[PDB]
């Protein structure tokens, strides 16, 4: 392989220690000619098509937030900042399409690709936007999953979301800033063919591990753990509400059965199921809402012995007396028990599906990186004699998908009409 820049040594810079291809200077040309080449003629508008959309769908959206001046709040608060990040992530590719591949990352004066931190600022601009906003976006996602778990399993309330979020919002920004400035001091930034961007990892696999292979696994993992913990807490709450409802209905219906049946045998035969259900519901249970169950079971205790001792209508009246104590405690606690889970299920499912949808693209991104490192492993040493274009063009696309979800998650005609009437004036 000979069109992989065997430019003559100019002594410095880099012409003595790049070690590409096990030789002093045989390295990388600006486009990618040995895996697709002319297919880049398509790709020159491919990432263009999505990028403008991934601006527009979020361009209004944060502005929509600035219409409301924080209407939706703390359990939906990091949606705003996560949506905000993709604006700049798209804006970098907008800068790429307003300048072009042939001047922002192609070496102006030495005809290979850009390496390291450039003096005149050009590559560093789009690197700063893409890397900093990218990593910060994934951090906003994982603290959103933290908010989801704290609202689902702990249910600590919006003020308790606020008190932690006042620290955690400024805590989130630091980690991408840290990794960005360590990358910039290390100056492992470089161009990437069939992109025009300025990212990391084209120099070496160890840089790819040091920036993007590790954290993208890590943040994804610590988001998914919180997500599944919240979901299993939700299902536990759902099944315990269901069985408490079952106890309530087999209490009430069977009491009515007692009320309209006669004879001395089936009254005890039904009241024993009543006592069983009342004990089962008291075990689930708050102190007055368990004391009511206690005095209910004691009322059935008053009821049953007269049925044993050959009194039928005395048992009937003893059974009838329960209704008031059912009403004054058991009913009014079942109402709030049902209402809390209904208020959770009608809304936090609608929020957690954003997480469920989000988790897939991040994984496909780290899988695409894990295959591109093997592909570069295959091709790097392959020189002299001897003796998958779609996975490339997919990766930048699926980085940009989440932004247009913020163009569809914010779809609500009521608040759009609020925006229109607010802005009409």
């Amino acid at each position, epitope marked *: 392989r000979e069109p992989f820049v065997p430019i003559l040594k100019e002594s410095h810079p880099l012409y003595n220690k790049v070690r590409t291809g096990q030789v002093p200077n045989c390295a990388v040309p600006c486009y990618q000619p040995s895996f697709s080449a002319d297919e880049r003629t398509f790709a020159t508008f491919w990432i263009g098509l999505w990028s403008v959309l991934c601006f527009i769908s979020t361009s209004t959206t944060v502005a929509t937030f600035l219409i409301d001046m924080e209407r939706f709040r703390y359990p939906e608060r990091p949606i705003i900042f996560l949506s905000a990040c993709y604006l700049c992530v798209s804006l970098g590719f907008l800068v790429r399409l307003v300048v072009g591949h042939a001047s922002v990352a192609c070496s102006r004066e030495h005809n290979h690709i850009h390496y390291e931190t450039t003096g005149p600022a050009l590559c560093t601009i789009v690197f700063l936007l893409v890397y900093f906003f990218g990593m910060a976006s994934s951090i906003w996602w994982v603290i959103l999953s933290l908010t989801w778990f704290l609202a689902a399993g702990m249910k600590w309330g919006n003020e308790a979301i606020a008190g932690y979020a006042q620290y955690f919002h400024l805590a989130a920004w630091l980690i991408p800033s840290v990794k960005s400035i360590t990358a910039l001091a290390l100056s492992s930034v470089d161009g990437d063919p069939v992109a025009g961007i300025c990212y990391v990892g084209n120099q070496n696999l160890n840089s790819l591990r040091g920036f993007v292979l590790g954290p993208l696994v890590l943040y994804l993992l610590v988001g998914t753990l919180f997500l599944l913990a919240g979901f299993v807490s939700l299902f536990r709450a759902r099944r315990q509400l269901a069985d408490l409802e079952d106890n309530w209905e087999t209490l009430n219906d069977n009491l009515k059965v007692i009320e309209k049946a006669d004879n001395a045998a089936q009254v005890k*035969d039904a009241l024993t199921k009543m006592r*069983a259900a009342a*004990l089962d519901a008291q075990k689930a249970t708050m102190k007055d809402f368990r004391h009511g169950f206690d005095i209910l079971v004691g009322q059935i205790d008053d009821a049953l012995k007269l049925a044993n001792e050959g009194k039928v209508k005395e048992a009937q009246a003893a059974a009838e007396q329960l209704k008031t104590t059912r009403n004054a405690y058991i009913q009014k606690y079942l109402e709030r028990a049902r209402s809390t889970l209904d208020k959770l299920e009608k809304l936090m499912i609608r929020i957690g599906i954003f997480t469920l949808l989000y988790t897939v693209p991040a994984s496909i991104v780290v899988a695409c990186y894990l295959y591109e490192q093997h592909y570069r492993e295959s091709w790097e040493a392959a020189l002299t004699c001897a003796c998958e274009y779609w996975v490339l063009m997919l990766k930048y696309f699926m980085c940009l998908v989440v932004g247009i979800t913020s163009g569809v998650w914010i779809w609500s005609g009521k608040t759009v009409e609020s925006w229109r009437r607010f802005t009409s004036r």
Partner: antibody
Amino acid sequence: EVQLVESGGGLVQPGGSLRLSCAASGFNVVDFSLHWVRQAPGKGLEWVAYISSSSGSTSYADSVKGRFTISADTSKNTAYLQMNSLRAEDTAVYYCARWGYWPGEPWWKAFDYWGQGTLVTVSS
Amino acid sequence: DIQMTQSPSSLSASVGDRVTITCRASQSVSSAVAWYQQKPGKAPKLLIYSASSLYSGVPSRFSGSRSGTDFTLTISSLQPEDFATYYCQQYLYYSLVTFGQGTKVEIKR
């Protein structure tokens, strides 16, 4: 500690009658119910009768209805079971047991402080 | 009224083994069942009350559990003292107390 004792065992003719006395030392019996639990020889346990003299609530198992009767004065802190017309099955060992009222913990505990019980036989 | 069935009615087990004795209620009792040990000759002893809670004084190799209407005592380590009979006993009202058949544990030989 609380302690129980059974008395009145032995042998009777069939169709006889007998009184078993369960005396409870320590705890008083206004606050705790007494039960009687029967083990026929080479069998599992089975249930007979109870009493709980805070209200007087005497029940009987179906095998002993119309044959067994009970009393429990709390001034002597003891209980009395009278059996009449002994069918020859009723040869067994009898136990006196304790059980606490609703609510709270002593109802959730079942029978805990058992007396060691005595044997009666339908000697023919 | 309700029926209590106890299944592993005779168990041969070596010293230091793990045994499980189940129990099944005919109706749906709530968490209201107990496990008793009777050694031959003496009065029985409480061992487990309210399905899973331990009584005070007994060693902690014994355990109990409930799955719906199916209750289970497990001994993790078979002590060389614990060769006796274990009876399953529900309670619900006072006049409805019924006992299981009782299983005997035996020395493996």
